[PDB]
């Protein structure tokens, strides 16, 4: 199945991590844990803002422009991205904004980190209507020495 994984400020505001006003190493660990040994699909913006490829996974970059690195697979459409994953139980889609919009209709599962922060931005995770998505897991945490804000992990499954 196809899954989306995302870190969301309030009102579904998203961004590249290194520009967001927070430090959430716990989210980092949750991300690696839920993507480990799965193919990931990302947009070029996200690809750039992490420099290297995610280790041990098929890394698939969706871009209209030609590839600029041979350690990853470069595709030019949603269908091409999916096809390049071959036969696996789960594909992880890791952003960013337009990428999330494109894959949401094909996804059966969401992995979301809610972050207790208000941040200005023009990029948002797509609207996931409560009537369409069942919350099957929620795990609340508060701020500590390592994590700057309260954060809540959530998994939802398409009804």
């Amino acid at each position, epitope marked *: 199945m196809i899954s989306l994984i995302a870190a*969301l400020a*309030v*009102d*579904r505001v998203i961004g590249m991590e290194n520009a967001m006003p927070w430090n959430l190493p716990a989210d980092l660990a949750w991300f690696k844990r839920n993507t480990l040994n799965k193919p990931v699909i990302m947009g070029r913006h996200t690809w750039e803002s992490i420099g290297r490829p995610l280790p041990g996974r098929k890394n698939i970059i969706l871009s209209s422009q030609p590839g600029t690195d041979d350690r990853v697979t470069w595709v030019k459409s949603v269908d091409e991205a999916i096809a390049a994953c071959g036969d696996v139980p789960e594909i992880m889609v890791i952003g960013g904004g337009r990428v999330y919009e494109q894959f949401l209709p094909k996804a059966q599962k969401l992995y979301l980190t*809610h972050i*207790d*922060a*208000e941040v200005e931005g023009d990029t948002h995770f797509p609207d996931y209507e409560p009537d369409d998505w069942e919350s099957v897991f*929620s795990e*609340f945490h*508060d*701020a500590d020495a390592q994590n700057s*804000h*309260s*954060y*809540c992990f959530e998994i939802l499954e398409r009804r």
Partner: nanobody, 127 residues
Framework: VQLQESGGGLVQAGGSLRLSCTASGRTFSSYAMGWFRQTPGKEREFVAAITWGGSTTLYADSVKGRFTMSRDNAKNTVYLQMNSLKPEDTAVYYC?????????????????????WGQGTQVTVSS
């Protein structure tokens, strides 16, 4: 999802009163919360709001610098600390939960959607 205001009663002008609002319902800590006040016959006035995790607040200009809203998710409670009260502050104060998850204080205030309301607590300031 259900709310109960507490605190409040008579206070002299210039004094302080602390209100609390306790919720029953497991999913409390995924909703913004707000305080409102109302005198008989008049529309509700927005007073304060706070995000789900309690880090970020928004205040009506009429109470800014005087009122502080805060939150304790481990106790399913939000509070309203009211200092330097005036006769004009006299009203029924209500607690309200957002109908939608994980919104900003701004959305809570400017795009109203109310999951539920408390029964209210009377706050009365003399002169």
């Amino acid at each position: 999802v259900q709310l109960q205001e507490s605190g409040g009663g008579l206070v002299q002008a210039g004094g302080s009163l602390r209100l609390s609002c306790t919720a029953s319902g497991r999913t409390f800590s995924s909703y913004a919360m707000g305080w409102f006040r109302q005198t008989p016959g008049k529309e509700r006035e927005f007073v304060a709001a706070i995000t789900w995790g309690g880090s970020t607040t928004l205040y009506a200009d009429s109470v800014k610098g005087r009122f502080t809203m805060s939150r304790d998710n481990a106790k399913n409670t939000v509070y309203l600390q009211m200092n330097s009260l005036k006769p004009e502050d006299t009203a029924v104060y209500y607690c309200a939960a957002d109908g939608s998850q994980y919104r900003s204080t701004y959305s809570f205030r400017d795009k109203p959607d109310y999951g539920s309301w408390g029964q209210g607590t009377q706050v009365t300031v003399s002169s």
